[PDB]
Structure formats: C-alpha cells, structure tokens
Design a protein around this ligand. Structure first.
Ligand SMILES: CC(C)[C@H](C)[C@@H](O)[C@H](O)[C@@H](C)[C@H]1CC[C@H]2[C@@H]3COC(=O)[C@H]4C[C@H](O)[C@H](O)C[C@]4(C)[C@H]3CC[C@]12C
Length: 1217
C-alpha cells in the first residue's frame, strides 16, 4: 500500500545512538578510502623498486620505507573496520528494541473487540514476529555497507585522476562495455527460468491430485498411470533445462572475452603515454587499478537498496498501530469510582450489532435483568448472541444504541480498573500462560500473602493435584516435563476466579470437552463458589442446567420467557421444542501463518524468517528457521548414493572434468601476462618496449577466445548431468510416495501442500549438491596447483616465505566475503523467546483484559529483552575486532614479502621481475582458495536442508501393496466377515471407537450398517480394503486371511463409491473410463447411461470432451455424483462399497440412486452406510453399531416386529425433520 520515507525509521534513536552513528560512519569511510590508497603505496614502491636497477643501495632505502607504510596502513584498517561493525550492529539493536517495547504498549490498550479472528489476531502476531526484523535489517548494518563501497567509488576517482588523468578516462569508459554484457546475461537467464516455472505447472497438478485424492487412486488400481503421466510432463522441463546451461556458458565466456579484450586496451596506451614522456610504471599502475575497483564498487552499494525498501514497507505497518487512537480508554481523573456494589446489572433497551460488519442484527430491542446474589441461565437455541453477553458487560464493545447500568449508574462513566476488577471470567479452554503454576493464581490478586493462595485452590478440587507434582507449586506449564495435560485440566483457572473474589461472576460455556465423570468433578466446584454473587451461567447444552433458580431464554433479539424451572418447563411455549432439540442432538493460526510464510521467503534467507507450528498446549511454537545446522541431517553415505543414481551419465562428466581443468588455466595466465608488463614498463630502449608489448596484447586477444571455449564446455556439460538427476529423483520419489499406507497422508504436516513442494524445490537442488560442487572443486584445485609450480620454478627463496604466510592471506580474503552478507548471523533466534510472550499476549487478550494484567505482560517483556541485547553486545565486539585484526595481517604480511624481496636482490641473488611474478601470482591465487573453504562445511555437515530427501526414499511402509510371497486372487464370491477386531485411528490414538466387532456377510446378499449418530460408521469400508490395519484379530474374506493376498490383485474387483466425489483434470471420457483398463467405446456409452445422465452427457458443447477438473465448465454437486456411479458400473465389481454421510447428497428430485438401488445391486454384495433413515431399505439384513459392537441384527421384518430394541429410537428421527 503506502510506505514511510527512509528517515523516521531513525526516530526511536535516543541521545546515545546519535553518537554510535557519528563514530560508526567515520569507520565506514576511512575503511572505504584505504583500498584505493593501497594502490598508491604499492604504486610508488615499484618506482623505487626498478627505476633503481643500477644503484642497489637506493633500492634498499626506498622499499624499507614503503614497507613501513603498509604497517601504518594496516593500523588504520585495524581501528576503522572495528568501528563500522561494533557501532552499527549494536546501535541497530537499541533502536529496534525500543520499537518492540512501544508496539506492545500499543497492542495492550486497544479495544478488545478489535480482535475477531478475521485475519486480525493472526496479523498482529505476524507483525510483531517478522516486521520488526525487517526494520532491524534495514537500519542496523546494511547502512554500513552503503557508506563503505560508495566511498571507494568517490575515492577511486580522486587517487586515479590525480596520478594520471588520461588513463582514468579510458578505464572508466571500459566499465559500460563490461556491465552491458554483464547484465544482458542476467536478463536472459531470468528469461528462461520463468519459462521453467511455467513448464512445470502442467505437472504441478498431476502430483497434487494424486495425493489429495489418494483414497480413489488406491481404490481403482491406477497408481501406476499417475507415473506415466507425471514422467512425460517432466521431459518438457529437462529439455528446457539444457539450454539454460548453454546460456550460462555463453554468459561467462562473453565476460572474460570483454574483460580480457579490454586490459589490452588500457595496457597499450600505457605503452604510448610512457614513450611520449608523460607517465611511468607507478603512475599508470595507480590510475588503472584505482579507477576499476572504484568503478566496480557501485555494484555492491546498490545491492543494499533491496533491503531499504522492505524496511519502508514493513516500517509503515508498524507505525499505523502505534499511533492509532482507540475509543474505550481509561480516564484516571474524569472517571468515578463507587463503593459497596450490589450487582443489579440491567440491560435497558439495548440494540447492538458487530461493528466489524453491521449487516446482521443480534440484540434488536433487548431487555433482561439480573438480580442480586442469584443465578441466571441466558441460553438460546442457536447462535442468537448467547455468547455475546459476557463480551459486553466487560465493556469490550460499547453498545451503539442503548444503555447498560450497574445499580442505576451507567457503566460508561466508570474507569477500567474498577469495573473490570469486580467481574470474574471463566471461559472456553481456559488460557494458562507458559509460566509457573503459582504466578497464574497471582493474576487474580497480585500481592496479598501465600496462605490465601492455598485456600483459594482448596475449595476448587485443586489443592491435591498441585501437590502430587514433585515440586513446591512450581511447574513450567508450557514445557511439558511433568504433564497435567488431561482433557480435564485441573482447573486452576477457577481458583483464579476465587482468589480475586468478584462480586459479579460471569461464567461461560465451560462444558465443551465431551463431558463425562471427569467434567462432573469440576461441576460441583462451580456449584460451591456461586454463593452471594450476581452470577450468570451461559450454557450451550441443557444437561447440567437442572438447578438454576431463574432462567431466561432468548430467541431473536429479545427474551421470550422467564421464570423458574417449574413454569419454564410448563406451557410448552418455545421450550418444549428446544429440549426436544437436546434429545434429537488454536491450530487454525499456525496453518494460517505458514501459508503467509509460504511464497513470502523467496528473497529473505533462512536466518530472518520463522516456521510456525502448534507446539505443546501452552504456547504457539516458533522455530527459528535456522534448523539447517542441528536438525534432520542427511545419511552420512549420501554423496556416494547420489553418484550411483547419476551414473548412466558418465560420458557427460568426462566431457566436463576435462573441460573444467581448462578453466583453471585462466588464473595463472591473467597473472603472468599482467606481471610481465610491469617489467616492460621500465625498459630504456623505446623500440624494444614496443615490439614486446605487442606480444603481451595478442595473448589477451588469444585468451579471450580460450575463455569462450572453456566455459561452454564446463557449464553445458555438468548441466546434462544435473538435469538427468533431478528427473530420476523426482520419478523415484512419486513412485515411493504412492506406496505408503493411507494414515501417512492423514497427518497434518504430510498434507498435499507440504508434499508437492518437496518435489518442486527440495528435489530440484540435488543438481546444486553433486554437480555444482564438483565443478568449482576441479577448477579451484587446478588453479591452486599450477600456480604453485610456476612460483617455484621462477624463484624459490621468496615463494617459500609466502607458503609460510599462506594461511594468513587466505584468511583475510575469507573475512572479506562474510562481510558482504553481514556478520550479524541468525538474528531470528535470539528474538524467539521474546516474541512468544508477545504471541501469547495477543491471542489470549480476552484474559489479559480481565484481571487488569496489562502491566505484568509488559514486565515479562522489558525484563527479558535485556538478554538478546547482551548477546548482541559480545557478538558485536568480538566479530568487529577479529575482522579488524585479520586485515592487519593482509597488509602487514605483504610488507614482509616485499622487504625480504629486496634483501635477495641487493645481495646479487635474484633480479627484478622474479620477485613481482612470485608476488602477483600467489596473491591472486589466494583470492580463490578462500571460496573452496567457504563451501567446505556444507559438504560434510549433512549436506543441507534439501539433500535430506531420503525420508521419502527410505521409509518402510506399514502396508506393502505387492509381494512375491503372497498368492494372488482368482475369483471372489463374497464372504465378508469380521472376526474379533478392535481398531483406532493412528492420527489421534486416544480414539477407541471399535471394541470387539463382529459381522458375517453371505454371498449374493447385502448389508445395511446404519448411521447410529456417527459412532465411527465410516471405518468399515476403510478395512474391507487395506486402507488401515486392525489392531488385533483376522479380517476374513473368501475363506482366506486378507493379509496374505496380493493387494493389487484383490482391489480390481472391489469398487467403492466415494463420499465426496471429485474428478480429475481431464475430459468426461477418461473420468468414466478411469475405472476400467482396456475398454474404449462399446460398453462405455451404456455404462454412462446407468446413473443415467445421458441428456447431461449428450447436451454438452464439444461432444463428450470438456474440462471439468479445473479451468473449464463447472458442474454442481448433484451432477458430479452422477459421474462417480458411472465408474463403478463399468468396473463391474463383486463387493460394492457405498458411503453416505453428513447429508452430502443434496439432490432434490432424487433419481440418481432410486435408479441405482435396483440396478447396481443385482448380484453385488453391498455395504451401505448412511445416517438418514430413508432410502436405506436393505432387502437382506440391517444392523446397528454401538460402542464397536452390533446390538441388533436381522432383516427388516423382525427388527420392527420387536417393540423397542434400539431401532425404534432411530424411528423417531423420521418425524424429527
Ligand atoms: C596489485 C594487485 C595485483 C593486488 C596485489 C591484488 O591483490 C588485487 O587486489 C586483485 C585481487 C584484484 C585487482 C583487480 C581485480 C580484477 C579487476 O577486475 C577485472 O577486470 C576482473 C575481470 C573478471 O571479473 C575476473 O573474474 C576478475 C578481475 C580480473 C578482477 C579480479 C581480481 C583483481 C585482479
């Protein structure tokens, strides 16, 4: 939407952060203008190094002096790279840790009705969690990289032009010839990747329907031809992935062919400007190098502007809640405070609707009255706003038309520390904050004593169960060490509402846990506190309502009838039907936040975002998302396994490993030709400096064509090898997902949106683990290897001191590559315990608003942000100092090589152009050896988070769909029998609805297992075919054990009809032929005319063909059911399995099954399940299931001849319309 300016992000800065930024921006400039000053000190050295070739005593003076200037330079990079990291990492924290402390003083004071779950309480939690890490990343340390590399651009054009100005206008005019083709590569490379994401979305729904509809894919045995349609929609992404590698070889070959055809330019006119008597070799070495690293260093300053715009986007979403003004606030001076309350709450002509949406009407002309010291029961028959009255006495909402008065005093003239203090609240699923179980009791009263805490939990059935825990009333209720994790939480929350002693006592519908004898223990606990209190009882079910002494019932906007439970039960006026209605009878945020986290982290790395889960039943768990270090490593023998899978392509690596050694030879060849022209620049024969600088230019032309035909080989090959590996893995993963049991798909983190992404991204970076980490190892170990053979043949007494100095040159060139991406490191991990305290004080705000606990959540927040600051005080003084010390050894150890270089020449041993060739080669080599030691952990350390796709390859399924040691099935006659069998759902193993079930179904008959009010009715058809396994006992079919038979040989003559039918993304000719392999045209027309939709299939535009899955014509719920019954009649099964539940038919003028009851049940053994007692006339037998057993069985002529049984209770439900 909108955005702030870049300033006003620096508006929480106190009078101490205007001092850490003044110092911290003199560190960023003096460290900036010290690489173009290095090119002036090293430039003036060579003037004295080789000018003085005839006087070997002036050499020792003018190199011993300029070597001392490197140590004086290294001590100004020592104390100025320390002052841009120890003053921007720490002063970017004290400004953002005062943004968190005022954003939470804003969302504790807004009106409580601002949060009604409508992507609102799932948005304030996300804004405090991630949007305060984007304002931190924008102002903390990437401002130091914006000043650093900009000042090199402004001081690379001042050292350059002052030395020799006719060479700082050639070298500047080169850079738009390199950056032209250096960005045309980066344009066309994106122009093919976007043709790959579009070429994959054809197969992004084929591996999406085959998992979300897995019950149908296993029922009709067609889990093989979801692999002959997924394989051929990857072959059009492989072939598009080949010419996205050729456009990487011709995008790096035409950059070393413009770079190495441009050093020949600036080194030719240096050979002219010296022959005219204008410059020398130390004023043409300064002008060229200072104006290129000055010109190349704008590509790093403008890399920070991507992060300075998210900090203006996320900066405005925070700064429109901090300065938002709410209505219902506390007036400490313009607000009264009474005494000796009585509690006669009265609603006097109040009308109200929700201010989120004023469409519906809730309390149109509403009038109820509350006595003093009595109980009422405000109850509706439906959602008539019966749960709204507790949200209005608390003044969570003002009544927009009406008045509410306490003892003849309107509540709009009282302060919100005296009104909310007198009312207690006990609600749905009572909120306990993840602290000790002693501090939760002290929310109802902050400080009285210890002995009243024990007396409060005494008369609440709580004094014992918090002593049967092996500590002194102290248990971390979030960290599930010793769990009071029953469905009956031992209700300490009722003990909160007793210690507070509220006069008005709002109770709520706190019987919503499938009540039993456990919920009757807390029932008398509520019955013993309700004395002398003006209390209400809001109830949803009238089972425990039997002793309430003045009940009032509302239906629509007002109360219908009042009185005690002698005259309310009388007269049958709108109460007898409601008690008849009694006789006829979170985890949403974490799924919502992860979808907001999905497709929003494509640029933010794994050190800044989170990954939201459900955790325990205390908090909302926030994983720091830097779990790639110490969570779920790969198998240790993976790198040999991923080479065994990728070995029919051996001739595409031998053509690439003898094509990646040839690119290691552009490392010495750049540094030998360039370090021979410093020699040539100091001749004194001006027609032998000419015909030797012609040879050193034709090599630059002849090595800008060697770099074209040695990157087309390195990157085209090793992309034939890298795309026949992310094609064989994706086919070996779908063929191993579609083999498991059905219960693995039932789990929440294995749904069909976290499993079609593991085939799109997590299996697409096996290319970047065994093909992009052998190319940059064979290259970098033949550039390290042939530049330590040149350096020893030329001169070996200097290149043995560099070899002892070489761990220090490769360390200083390694710390200059961590600094490009910040030294902060995993900044979402320290601010994780802090964020959950803001996370639990937003979603539990209806318990923070009562008890006046809006200052103790803030004092668990300012007392705890002290730890992630003193973590970021030691990390910013160590990382700032060790970076400022490793740079002292880069400049301070080139002073030792060059001084010892002038100790061997002056004693007659060496010469010039043998000390420089040893120096130039072994420093440019050390710049790319510290790239090999940067990808060195990620090979050993478990690969990475995408090299661990072996959980889907190596996972032994509980049910094996095919065997060799199992006899197949020839012909089923139908002998369905359940022996002594119990069963539980493996998703939630506490559900135990099956207890020793038994049936016996004879061939050529039917079965009519009734609904019985949803007592686990939809699991008999989930065991005739093995979608699950029983816990004990045998399932007998056709006289044989079912776990001894070939599963694919059995399912091709047992066909179900789905509860909720959905179709595949194809025509209506495949979706009616998917259930029969081989038949084409003859019996497909007539089987379409069985759930006769023939005018529906003749009246259709393109004959039979029409898209019905997606992006075509849309069908109704009554017409999609007609398609699924056309499948089963073409398959012609032996055991039919119908399923009807939760009134999902919805087909008025019912003729889709009036035809199908008598046509599809001719010789088929059917098992019908339906909750409706209509169109269920099983002509053979009928049964009733209760508690995992049958209670009554037989045909429908002896079940009705018996007087009651249990079927007569179901017979009442026909008149219960
Ligand atoms: C005086 C130098 C020899 C100095 C000691 C040396 O440390 C220097 O800082 C090195 C690391 C730099 C100076 C100039 C740089 C080059 C200047 O920019 C270029 O022309 C590019 C072209 C291309 O991008 C190459 O891959 C790197 C290459 C060719 C750069 C590679 C590294 C350098 C050669």
């Amino acid at each position: 939407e909108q955005s702030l300016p870049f300033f006003k992000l620096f508006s929480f800065a106190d009078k101490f952060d205007y001092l850490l930024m003044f110092v911290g921006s003199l560190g960023a400039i003096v460290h900036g203008s010290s690489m173009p000053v290095f090119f002036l000190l090293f430039g003036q050295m060579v003037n004295g190094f080789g000018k003085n070739q005839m006087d070997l005593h002036q050499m020792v003076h003018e190199v011993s002096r300029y070597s001392l200037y490197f140590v004086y330079l290294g001590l100004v990079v020592c104390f100025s790279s320390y002052a841009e990291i120890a003053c921007w990492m720490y002063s970017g924290e004290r400004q953002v840790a005062a943004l968190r402390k005022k954003y939470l003083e804003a969302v504790l004071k807004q009106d409580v009705g601002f949060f009604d779950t409508d992507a609102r309480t799932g948005d304030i939690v996300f804004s405090v969690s991630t949007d305060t890490l984007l304002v931190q990343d924008a102002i903390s340390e990437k401002v130091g990289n914006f000043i650093h590399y900009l000042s090199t651009f402004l001081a690379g054009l001042v050292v350059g032009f002052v030395s020799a100005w006719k060479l700082a206008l050639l070298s500047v005019a080169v850079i738009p010839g390199i950056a032209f083709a250096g960005g045309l590569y980066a344009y066309t490379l994106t122009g093919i990747t976007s043709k790959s994401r579009e070429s994959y979305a054809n197969a992004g729904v084929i591996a999406e329907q085959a998992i979300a509809q897995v019950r149908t894919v296993y029922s009709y045995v067609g889990e093989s031809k979801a692999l002959n349609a997924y394989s051929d929609a990857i072959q059009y992404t492989l072939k598009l992935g080949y010419k996205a590698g050729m456009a990487k070889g011709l995008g790096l070959g035409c950059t070393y062919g413009i770079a190495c055809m441009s050093w020949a330019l600036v080194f030719w006119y240096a050979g002219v400007f010296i022959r005219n008597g204008q410059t020398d070799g130390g004023k043409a070495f300064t002008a060229i190098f200072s104006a290129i690293v000055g010109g190349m260093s704008l590509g790093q300053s403008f890399s920070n502007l991507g992060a300075f715009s998210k900090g203006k986007a996320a900066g405005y979403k925070l700064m429109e809640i901090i300065n938002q003004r709410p209505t219902i606030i506390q007036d400490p001076l313009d607000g009264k405070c009474l005494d000796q309350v009585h509690g006669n709450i009265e609603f006097k002509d109040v009308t109200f609707s929700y201010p989120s949406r004023p469409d519906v009407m809730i309390f149109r002309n509403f009038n109820i009255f509350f006595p003093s010291g009595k109980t009422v029961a405000v109850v509706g028959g439906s959602g008539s706003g019966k749960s709204t009255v507790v949200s209005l006495i608390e003044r969570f909402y003002d009544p927009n038309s009406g008045q509410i008065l306490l003892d003849g005093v309107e509540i709009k003239t009282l302060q919100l520390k005296f009104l909310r203090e007198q009312i207690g609240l006990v609600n749905q699923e009572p909120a306990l904050f993840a602290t000790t179980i002693l501090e939760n009791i002290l929310y109802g009263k902050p400080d009285a004593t210890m002995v009243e805490v024990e007396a409060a939990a005494s008369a609440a059935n709580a004094h014992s169960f918090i002593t049967l825990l092996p500590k002194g009333y102290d248990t971390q209720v979030g960290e599930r060490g010793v769990q009071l994790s029953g469905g009956q939480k031992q209700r300490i929350a009722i003990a909160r509402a007793m210690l507070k002693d509220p006069k008005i006592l709002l109770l709520d519908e706190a019987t919503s846990a499938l009540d039993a004898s456990s919920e009757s223990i807390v029932q008398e606990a509520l019955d013993r506190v309700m004395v002398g209190r003006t209390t209400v009882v809001v109830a949803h079910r009238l089972c425990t309502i039997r002793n309430v002494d003045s009940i009032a019932v509302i239906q629509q906007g007002q109360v219908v009838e009042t009185g005690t439970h002698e005259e309310l039960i009388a007269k049958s006026g709108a109460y007898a039907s409601l008690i008849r209605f009694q006789e006829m009878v979170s985890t949403r945020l974490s799924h919502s936040l992860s979808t907001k986290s999905l497709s929003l982290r494509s640029g933010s790395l794994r050190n800044l975002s989170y990954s939201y889960s459900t955790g325990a039943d205390g908090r909302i768990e926030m994983i720091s998302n830097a779990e790639t270090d110490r969570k779920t490593r790969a198998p240790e023998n993976y790198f040999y396994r991923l080479l065994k899978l990728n070995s029919p392509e051996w001739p595409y690596s031998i053509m690439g490993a003898v094509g990646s050694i040839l690119s290691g030879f552009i490392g010495p060849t750049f540094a030998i030709v360039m370090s021979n022209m410093i020699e040539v620049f100091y001749y004194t024969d001006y027609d032998s400096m000419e015909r030797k600088t012609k040879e050193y230019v034709f090599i630059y032309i002849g090595a800008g064509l060697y770099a074209v035909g040695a990157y087309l080989i390195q990157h085209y090959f090793f992309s034939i090898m890298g795309e026949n590996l992310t094609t064989r893995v994706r086919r070996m993963m779908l063929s191993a997902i579609l083999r498991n049991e059905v219960g693995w798909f039932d789990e929440d983190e294995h749904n069909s949106s976290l499993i079609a992404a593991r085939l799109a991204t997590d299996a697409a970076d096996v290319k970047s683990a065994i093909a992009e980490r052998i190319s940059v190892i064979l290259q970098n170990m033949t550039s390290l290897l042939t530049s330590f053979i040149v350096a020893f043949i030329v001169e070996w007494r200097v290149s043995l001191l560099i070899l002892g100095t070489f761990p220090l040159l490769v360390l200083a060139n390694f710390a200059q590559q961590l600094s490009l991406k910040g030294f902060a490191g995993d900044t979402a991990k320290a601010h994780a315990k802090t964020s959950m305290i803001a996370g639990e004080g937003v979603s539990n705000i209806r318990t923070v608003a009562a008890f006046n606990a809006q200052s103790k959540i803030l004092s668990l927040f300012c007392h705890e942000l002290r730890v992630p600051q003193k973590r970021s005080l030691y990390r910013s003084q160590t990382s700032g100092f060790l970076f400022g010390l490793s740079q002292l050894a880069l400049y301070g150890s080139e002073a030792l090589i060059l001084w010892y270089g002038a100790h061997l020449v002056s004693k007659g041993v060496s010469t010039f152009s043998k000390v420089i060739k040893v120096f130039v080669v072994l420093v440019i080599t050390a710049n790319s050896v510290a790239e090999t030691v940067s990808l060195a952990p990620e090979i050993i350390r478990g690969g990475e988070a995408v090299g661990s796709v072996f959980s889907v390859l190596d996972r032994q399924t509980r049910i094996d769909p095919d065997d060799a040691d199992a006899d197949p099935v020839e012909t089923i006659r139908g002998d369905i029998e359940f022996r002594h069998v119990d069963f539980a759902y493996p998703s939630r193993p506490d559900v135990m609805v099956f207890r020793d079930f038994n049936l016996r179904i004879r061939a050529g008959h039917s079965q009519a297992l009734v609904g019985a009010s949803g007592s686990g009715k939809s699991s008999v058809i989930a065991m005739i075919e093995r979608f699950y396994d029983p816990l004990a006992g045998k399932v007998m079919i056709d006289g044989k054990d079912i776990r001894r038979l070939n599963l694919k040989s059995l399912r091709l003559k047992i066909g179900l009809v789905q509860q909720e039918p959905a179709l595949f993304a194809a025509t209506i000719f495949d979706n009616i032929a998917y259930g029969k392999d081989g038949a084409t045209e003859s019996e497909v027309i007539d089987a379409a005319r069985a759930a006769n939709a023939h005018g529906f299939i003749s009246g259709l535009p393109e004959g039979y063909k029409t898209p019905v899955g997606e992006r075509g014509v849309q069908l109704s719920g009554g017409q999609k059911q007609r398609i699924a019954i056309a499948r089963a009649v073409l398959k012609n099964p032996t055991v039919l399995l119908l399923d009807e539940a939760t009134s999902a038919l919805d087909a008025e003028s019912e003729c889709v099954l009036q035809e199908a009851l008598e046509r599809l049940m001719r010789g088929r053994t059917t098992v019908v399940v339906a909750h409706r007692l209509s169109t269920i006339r099983g002509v053979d037998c009928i049964g009733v299931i209760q508690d995992g057993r049958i209670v009554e069985q037989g045909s429908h002529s002896e079940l009705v001849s018996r007087p009651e049984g249990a079927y007569s209770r179901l017979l009442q439900l026909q008149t219960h319309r």
